[PDB]
Amino acid sequence: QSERAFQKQPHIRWYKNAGLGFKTPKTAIEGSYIDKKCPFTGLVSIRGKILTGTVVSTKMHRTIVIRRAYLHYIPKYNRYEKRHKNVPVHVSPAFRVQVGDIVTVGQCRPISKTVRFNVVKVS
Amino acid sequence: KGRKLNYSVQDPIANYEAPITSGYKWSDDQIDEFFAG
Amino acid sequence: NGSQSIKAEDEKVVMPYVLRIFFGRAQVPPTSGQKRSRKIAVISVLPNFKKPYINDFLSLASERLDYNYFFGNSHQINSSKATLKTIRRMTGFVNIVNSTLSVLRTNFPLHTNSVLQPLIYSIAMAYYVLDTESTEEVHLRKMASNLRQQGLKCLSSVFEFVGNTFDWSTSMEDIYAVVVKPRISHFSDENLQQPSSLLRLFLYWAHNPSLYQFLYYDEFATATALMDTISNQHVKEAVIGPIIEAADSIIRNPVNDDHYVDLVTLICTSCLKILPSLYVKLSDSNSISTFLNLLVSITEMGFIQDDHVRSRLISSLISILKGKLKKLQENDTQKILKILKLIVFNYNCSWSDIEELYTTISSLFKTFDERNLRVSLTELFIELGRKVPELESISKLVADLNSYSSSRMHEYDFPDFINEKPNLNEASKSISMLKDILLPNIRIGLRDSLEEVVLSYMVKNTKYFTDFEDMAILLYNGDEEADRRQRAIKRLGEHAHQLKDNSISHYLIPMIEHYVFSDDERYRNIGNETQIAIGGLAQHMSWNQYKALLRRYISMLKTKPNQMKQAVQLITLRIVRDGAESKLTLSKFPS
Amino acid sequence: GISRDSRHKRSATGAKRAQFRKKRKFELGRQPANTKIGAKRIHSVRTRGGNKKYRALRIETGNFSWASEGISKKTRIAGVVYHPSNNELVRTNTLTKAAIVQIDATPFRQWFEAHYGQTLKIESSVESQFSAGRLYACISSRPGQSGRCDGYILEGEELAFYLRRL
Amino acid sequence: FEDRFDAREHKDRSNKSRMQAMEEYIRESSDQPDWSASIGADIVNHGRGGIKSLRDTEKERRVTSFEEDNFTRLNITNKAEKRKQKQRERNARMNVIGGEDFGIFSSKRKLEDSTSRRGAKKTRSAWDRAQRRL
Amino acid sequence: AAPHHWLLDKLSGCYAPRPSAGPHKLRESLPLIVFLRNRLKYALNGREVKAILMQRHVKVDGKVRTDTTYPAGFMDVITLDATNENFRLVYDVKGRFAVHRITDEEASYKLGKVKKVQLGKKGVPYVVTHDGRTIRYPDPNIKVNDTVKIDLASGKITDFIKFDAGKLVYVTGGRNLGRIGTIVHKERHDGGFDLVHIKDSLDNTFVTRLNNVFVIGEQGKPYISLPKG
Amino acid sequence: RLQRKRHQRALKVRNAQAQREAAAEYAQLLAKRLSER
RNA sequence: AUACAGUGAAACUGCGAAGGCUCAUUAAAUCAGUUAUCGUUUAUUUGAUAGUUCCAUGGUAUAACUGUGGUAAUUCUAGAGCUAAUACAUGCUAAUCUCGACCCUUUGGAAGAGAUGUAUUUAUUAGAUCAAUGUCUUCGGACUCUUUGAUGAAAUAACUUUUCGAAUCGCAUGGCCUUGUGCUGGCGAUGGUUCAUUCAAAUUUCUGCCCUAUCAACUUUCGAUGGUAGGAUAGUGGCCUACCAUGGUUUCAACGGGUAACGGGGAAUAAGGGUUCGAUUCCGGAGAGGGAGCCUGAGAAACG
C-alpha cells in the first residue's frame, strides 16, 4: 500500500472521530490504510450539510460520482420534470461502491477543483 | 503530452529576425576540406 | 545573554579534553581557596562571593550537561565544589534568621547538590575517585540531620545522591564505610512514605547485590542489614501497592527467599504477604503472580507452618486451581504449592493434581474416576479442580457430571458446611449458566439436575437435545409452575443461553415467549422475586440496545406484562425511573 | 507566479468564451524561490497587513531531528538526490520541503557519545552513516514560507522506504 | 427548502384592496361619526384649489401628527415635490369636484377581483361551506 | 435605505445611519441615534443626541459608551440616569425592536446564548456570547445554545439555563423572528431545519434553525419580565 | 525623574499583586467547579 | 519673569480631499439571497489577556538656522559651520509558588524537596476506572453484569540574527518615623502581548422568468478528469509544475445561437382606482495618451 514516494503516512495508526451520527469502521480506526482525506482519520474536519443519492460512475480511483434526483414543485407547466445532479467524491475504506448504492456525503474543505464531499455512509 | 511539444506556428516570432545570405565567412568547400577527417 | 551563553554552551564542546579541563580549571580558579578550604572548611564567605560560588555551581551544571559524558572532571573542580557546598551549608546554618540571603544560599545549595549529582550522572564509571572519603565525610557532617528529609514524592537531592551511590560498583565504599543504608532505611521505614518509597526499595534491592559481591565482611554484614531491612519493611510495599509496579516486590521477595531464611515467623509473614499479593489486587500480571506464588512456595519450602499457613496455602491453591493461567504454568506452580503446603489435604491435593496434570494425557479422566471411587475428605481443592474441569475445559464431561454428583453425594452424607459448599456450587453454576459455554452450560444443567435429586423430568428434558417438543414441554412446565429469585433467574438464564442470539434456528418467538413466561412466573412471586424480575427486565433492556434489537423488543413488550398485571393488581412503586425509561423509549422511537 | 483563479481555465463541464477580467491583487502569485545552499539570506516580504513572510533562498543551518528520541540539532546541507515533484530539481540541487538531503552527522555523533559514553541497538544501514558521517534526512519546514530548514532524520523503516526508491 | 425573512409578507399593506366605493359604504353603515371639519376650514387656497378630498385631509392629518410628534417641519424636496404636488393638484382639479373625487368612476379596476371574493376563506368544499354557514 | 427592525418612519431623511462596529452584527442591532432620537424621542436631531451623549446619560450594559452609532443588539439593557430609565429591548412578533421598560433588579443582569466552548490556551475553559463576553470558567456541561446570565457589575456568569426538550426559547432569525411559546415539538436534524418548535394561540407549528433560537427560561417562569398588550 | 522611578515601580508591583493573584483566584473557582462536578 | 513664558509670515508635524466621466455589448459564470471557513486576512468596535540578573541615567549625526554660491529656471541646487528629540541606536533594574517528617491545639506552620513566560518553525503522548438506594445478606463485605453518575477514550528535546517585564498622564499629602523625599502610597485613563467578537474582503454549498435539437456532442488544442508531492498563497484548491491513471458533462436538455441584455431580472419604495407609465441598486468589464514592469497600505495590481 505504498506506490508513491515522500513518506506516505498519516500526518498527526492515527484515528479520530468527526462525531455527528456517522460510524468509523474498524479498519479505518486501526488499519493499514493511510486515510489522507477520508474524514474519519483524515486531515479534514466536518461541517456544513449532508447530501444523499445513488451513483453513475466510479471509474477513476478516489472519484465517486453521485447522482441526486429530487422532487421540486414546478408551477410553470404544472408537472414535475425530474432532477439530476452530479458530485465527485473521494474514497473511504468501507465500501467499494458499484452502480446503484444510495450513499451520503458531508461538506468539507475543497479537495480537488470540484469536490467538497466525502463518503460517510453506505446502506 | 498535452502542452509537451506543440508543433504549431506562432504569431510574433514568424518575423522576429531576418536571415543573412553569405553567413559563414568560410566556404562550404572549406567546410568539406576542413573536416574531411 | 542567557540565550547567548546557552549558544556558547551548545558550542562549548568543540575543543579537546585538555582544553575542556583547562576551561573548567579556570572556572575552578575563581574562588576555590584550596589553601584555606581543602583541609576542613572555609575561612570566610560573602553574599556576592557566594553569588560567584552559586554561579560556579551553575557553570558546573551547564558544563556537565553540555559534556554529559566526560565533563573534563578534575580534583581541583572537586575541591572547589566541596568548598562551595561547605560554604553554602555553613552560611545557611550559621546566618541569622532573616531568610532572604539564607534562601538565596539555600537555593544555591540545592543547585550545587544538583550539579554534584550531575557529575555522577555524567561520568559515573569513569573516574571513581579514590579520595572519596574526604567529600563523603564533608557531606555527611553537613547532612547528618537529613535523616527523614528526603522522604517525599519529589525530594530527590540526597535521595538521588543515595540512589547514585547505591547503584555503583566500587563507589559504595563511602556507603559501607559507616552508613548510607541506615539513614536511607530510616526514611524508608518512615510511615508517611510517598511513591518514591518504591524507588528506594528498588535501589536497595539492586544495591544488596553489590554488598553481596563485595569481599568485605563489613559489606557482608551490610547485605545482612539489607535483608533485615527487607524483613523490617514488611508494610511499605504492602501499603504502596497503588500501581502495576508489583514486579519490584516480586523481584525482592524471590531474592529474599533465595537469599535469607532467618525466622519461621518471617517466612509465615512472607507467605501471607504473597497470599495477599494474589488476594489484594486483581491487576497482577502472569509472570508477577507466578513469581509471587513461587516465592511463597520458596518460603514454605524452608519454614512453613503446619495449620495456619497450611490453610493459607490451601486457600492459595484453591484460588490458583480455579485460575490455572498462562498455559498450565500457573497450574504447575499451583501443583508445586499444593505439594509444598504439607498437610493431609495438601497430600491428597498433590496426588489428585499430579494424577491429572501429566502433560495432556488420559490420566485426567483416569484420575477423576480414581478419586470418585476413592473420594477424598479434603474436597475443597478437589471441588476447585473438578469445577475448573466442569467449566469450559473441553475434556471430562461425564467425569464433570460424576464430580458434581459426587459432591452432591458428600453434601447429602454430611447432613451444614457441605451445604454451604453447595451454596458455592450454585454460585459457580449461576456464572456458568450466564455465559457463552456449550459443554459447561450442559454440565451446569446436570449439576442443577443433581441438586434437584416432574421437576427432574423437566430438567432432563430441557437438557435433551431435541428442542421442539422439549421446548414445548418446557413451556408447559412453566405453565404448571405458573398456575424463586435466583432459581428462576438461573432457569431463564439457561433458556436465554439456549436462545441467545442464535438466529439460525426457528421458534425463536416461542423461545422468547418461554423466557417471558418464566419471567412472569417469577414476577408473580412479588414478596421475593420482584427484585429478580426488575433485574431481568433491566438486563433485557440493556440487551435491547446492545447491538441487537429484534427479539429484545418483543422481550421488552412481554416483560411489560408483569407491569400490566402489577398495575391491574394495584388498581406504592417507583414512577421516576419508569418515566425516565419511557423517555428513553421515546428517544429510541425517534431513531 | 501568475494567478490563483478558475477563470483562466476550464471546469468539469468544458466551457469556453472566457475573456473575463483584469486580474486583481488577491490573485497574487509570487515568483518560485527555489531555495539553495549558500550564505544565509532570507527576503522579508510583506503581505496582508504586517504579515511578514520569510522567503529563504540560501539557508544552511538545518535543524534536523533525531527520530527515536526527537533531538532537533543543528547541521549543514549537502544535496538532494531524489525528489520527483520535479526530477530536474535534484539535477539543479535546490532545497524544498519533503526533500531527502544529506547531512554530515557530526553533532549527532557528539550527542550519542555525550549521552551514551561509547561510540559506534540502532539499525545497521544508519550505523554505516554513524561511522562515515553523511546520513539521509528529509526536510519538514518550508523555507519558501516560514524561511526555515527543519527536518527529520532517516531511521530504519523510512530509510529503506527511500533507499528502495532511489 | 429553508426560510428567508420576508418583510413584504409580514408588512401591513392594506392598500392593494382599499377601494373608495367599499370605504364609502362602510362610512355610510358605520354607526359612529366621522370627524368632519368646521365647514370653511377645509377649503385650501381661497378656492383656487379644491375643497380638499378625504384622502388629502387624511394625509394632512397624518403629516401634522408626525409634525407635532417629532418637532420638525417638512420641506420643499425638489424631486418628490415636482412629482407629487404638481401631479396631485392637477389630478385634483381634474377629478375632485366640490370636495368629492369622481376619478374612480373613470377608471377600470375590478372591485370583486381584488377586494371582494375572499381568498383564504374560499370554501372549496361542500363540507367546508356547510361548516362556514353552520 | 433602512432595515425592517428599527420601526423607522419613511418621512425621516435620505441617508440612513449605518451602525458602527461593536458587540452585535449590523443586521441584528439598532444604534443609539435611531434609539433615542426617533423611537422614544429623547432628541430631535443628531446634534442634540450627540449633546446628550457627550453629557453621558446612557449606561448600556452598565458602562457609559458615549457613541452615536453604537450597535445595541438583543437585550442590551439601556440605562439612563435621569428618571432611572431601565430599558430591555427584545423582539416583537412582527420583526421590530420592542423596547420594554424594566426595573433595577432586572437591569442588574442580562442573559446570553453561548456560541462555543474552547480549550483555547493554557487549560482555560472559555465561553462567548452574542456581545462576546469572554468570561472565565463555566461548568463542563455548557453545550452550544445554552444561556448564561451575566453579572453586569463584574462579568461573571451567575445562573445557567440548560438547553433541552422542555425549555422556554426565543427565536431571533428567519421567518420565525420574534416568537414565543416553545412547545409543540422537538426535532434535531443533522445540518438544517433543526430546532424546538413554538406554539401559537391555536398552538400552531414552526420551523427554524439552532443558531436562530436561544433560551430565556422555563415553561411559565422566565426571570426576564416581558411586555404585554 | 526619581519620583517617576518611585511611581513606576509601585504601579508595577501593584499590577503584579493584582493580576497574578486574581488569575489564581478564579482558577480556584475552576477547582471548586471541578470538585463539585 | 537676565535658561522657557503672548501676536506669530515660512518650515517639520496630526489629519483633509474618505470615492468622479466615457467607451466595446456579459444569459443565474454579471447579480441577489443562502451554507461554511478547527479552508483564511483583518486597522478601527466590543469582552478578555505577561514571572531566566558572578569580578542617580547611556553616543555622535542631521535639520530648521547662518554663511558662500551656481543656473534662464522649478517644492532644481551644492559646498562650509553649528544645534535639539517619545528621530537613530547601545544600554542602570525586590524576592513570591506548591508538596508539607515535626506540629499544639489554635496566634499552627518551621525543616527539606520541587518553581518559575511570550513570538517563530520541528516529535512522543496526558489528552480504563470508582460512589450507592441493590445481586448474597451470613443485617459484616470481593462488589459492577445488572439500578443510576464521574476524571476520561499542553507535558517536554531544539532553532530564530526574538519582542517585552511602562523613560505616558490625571485625580488624590493621604499613611507611616528605617530621622530624611527613609518607604511615598490608593485609584483611574493611555500603553503593552495574545485570544474572541464586530467590520470588511476572498473562496465556497445550494436556489432564482426568453425562445432554443437547423446547437448532439463537448471536453484533453491556458490540465481535459482525478490521484501523490512540492511551489505560491491570506489560506482550501491542477491555482502552477514533475510523475501516474483516461477520465468528466449530456435527450432527466451538455455545449453552443440574439435582441424592444438605452432593456431585464423583486433590485426596491410603494402611492386610498394609473392595472406591465408610476421608486431605485446593477447593463458587462475596463481607462486615466498606449500596452509592460515595480512600489505604498487594515483594504489597491491607486483617479492622487
In order, the DSSP letters of A48-108 are S-EEEE-EEE--STT--EEE--------SSSS-PPP--EE-EE--TT----SS--EEEEE-
Amino acid, single-letter form, for residue G10? A
Euclidean distance between CA atoms C478 and E98, whole angstroms: 103
* Nucleotides of chain H touched by protein CB (<7 A): 26-27, 29-30, 33-39, 41-57, 94-96, 99-102, 111-114, 120-125, 134-138, 142, 145-148, 150-152, 154-155, 157-162, 165-169, 181, 183-185, 187-188, 191, 194-208, 218-243, 245-257, 266, 269-275, 279-280, 285-287, 296-301
Euclidean distance between CA atoms C276 and E114, whole angstroms: 96
Q: Residue D58: how many CB atoms within 10 A of its CB?
A: 14
Question: What residue has cell string 433560537?
Answer: F213
Please, are residues C262 and C227 in contact by the beta-carbon 8 Å criterion? yes
Euclidean distance between CA atoms D138 and D159, whole angstroms: 10
Distances (CA, A) of A21 to A114, C470, C591, F188, G17: 25, 44, 11, 12, 49
Cβ within 8 Å of residue E81, ≥6 positions away: none
Cell of C542: 440493556
Contacting F with CB below 8 Å, chain E residues are: 2-7, 10-11, 63, 66, 69-72, 74
Euclidean distance between CA atoms C322 and C550, whole angstroms: 37
What's the gap between Cα D80 and its chain centre? 9
**Consecutive H or E run containing C311:** helix C308-323
Sheet holding A103-107, edge to edge: A50-53, A103-107, A117-122, A89-90
Amino acid, single-letter form, for residue A28? A
What length is written for chain E?
Answer: 134
Q: Residue D71: how many CB atoms within 10 A of its CB?
A: 15
Q: Taking the alpha carbons of D94, D97, D103, D106 in that order, is the dihedral positive or negative?
A: positive
Please, are residues D58 and D80 in contact by the beta-carbon 8 Å criterion? no
Question: What residue has cell string 475448573?
Answer: C388
Distances (CA, A) of F17 to E73, F3, F6, F21, F90: 21, 11, 11, 12, 20
Asked if residue F27 keeps its beta carbon closer than 7 A to nucleic acid strand H, the reply is yes
Which residues make beta-bridge pairs with A105?
Answer: A51, A119
CATH code at A77?
Answer: 2.40.50.1000
Cβ within 8 Å of residue C528, ≥6 positions away: C484, C485
Q: Taking the alpha carbons of C26, C27, C30, C32 in that order, is the dihedral positive or negative?
A: negative
Phi/psi of residue A63, each to 5°? Answer: -130, 105
Nucleotide nearest to D32 (CA to C1'): H231
- 3 state SS of D55: strand
- 3 state SS of D73: strand
Phi/psi of residue D71, each to 5°? Answer: -115, 100
Q: Are strands F78-80 and A103-107 parallel, antiparallel or unpaired?
A: unpaired
Euclidean distance between CA atoms C273 and C260, whole angstroms: 16
Domains for chain F: give ranges and CATH numbers.
1-105 (3.10.290.10), 110-160 (2.40.50.740), 163-229 (2.30.30.30)
The string of DSSP codes covering D96-119 is -TT-EEEEE-HHHHHHHHHHSSS-
Asked if residue D121 keeps its beta carbon closer than 7 A to nucleic acid strand H, the reply is no
Burial class (CB in 10 A: 0-12, 13-18, 19+), F146: buried
Asked if residue C420 keeps its beta carbon closer than 7 A to nucleic acid strand H, the reply is yes
**Consecutive H or E run containing D152:** strand D150-153
Measured between beta carbons, which residues in chain E are less than 8 angstroms from residue F193? 2
Name the residue closest to H250, CA to C1'. D13
Cell of F196: 424546538
Cell of F147: 444561556
The vertex-F174 CA angle with F171 and F176, nearest 5°, equals 50
Phi/psi of residue C549, each to 5°? Answer: -140, 30
From the CA atom positions of chain E, what is the Rg in Å? 20
Cell of B18: 531576418
The string of DSSP codes covering C320-375 is HHHH-TTTTHHHHHHHHHHHHS-SHHHHHHHHHHHTT-SSSSTHHHHHHHHHHHT-
Closest residue in E to F172 (Cα–Cα): E5
Among C122, C171, C116, CA closest to C142:
C116
Closest residue in F to E66 (Cα–Cα): F11
Q: How many CA atoms lie within 13 A of D161 on its CB side?
A: 20
Domain that holds residue A50: 1-123
Q: How many CA atoms lie within 13 A of C491 on its CB side?
A: 28
Q: How many domains does chain A have?
A: 1
Which residues make beta-bridge pairs with A106?
Answer: A50, A118
Asked if residue A68 keeps its beta carbon closer than 7 A to nucleic acid strand H, the reply is no
Which residues make beta-bridge pairs with A119?
Answer: A105
Contacting A with CB below 8 Å, chain F residues are: 190-192
Euclidean distance between CA atoms F123 and C570, whole angstroms: 55
Nucleotide nearest to C106 (CA to C1'): H112
Nucleotide nearest to D48 (CA to C1'): H41
Which residues make beta-bridge pairs with D54?
Answer: D44
- 3 state SS of C7: helix
Q: Are strands A117-122 and A89-90 parallel, antiparallel or unpaired?
A: parallel
Amino acid, single-letter form, for residue A94? A
Cell of D37: 545552499
Euclidean distance between CA atoms C520 and C564, whole angstroms: 11
Closest residue in F to E68 (Cα–Cα): F44
Give the resolution to one decimal, in Å. Answer: 4.1
Distances (CA, A) of E114 to A53, A75, C26, G7: 45, 22, 108, 81
Q: Residue C479: how many CB atoms within 10 A of its CB?
A: 12
Q: Are strands E100-101 and F78-80 parallel, antiparallel or unpaired?
A: unpaired
Among C349, C401, C355, C399, CA closest to C377:
C349
Query: Residue D74 gets which letter from DSSP?
Result: E
**Consecutive H or E run containing C32:** none
Closest residue in C to D116 (Cα–Cα): C69
Mind telling me how many Å the CA of F32 is from chain E's nearest CA? 17
Contacts 24+ apart (CB under 8 A), A68-75: none
Q: Strands of C410-522 (E only): list them.
A: none
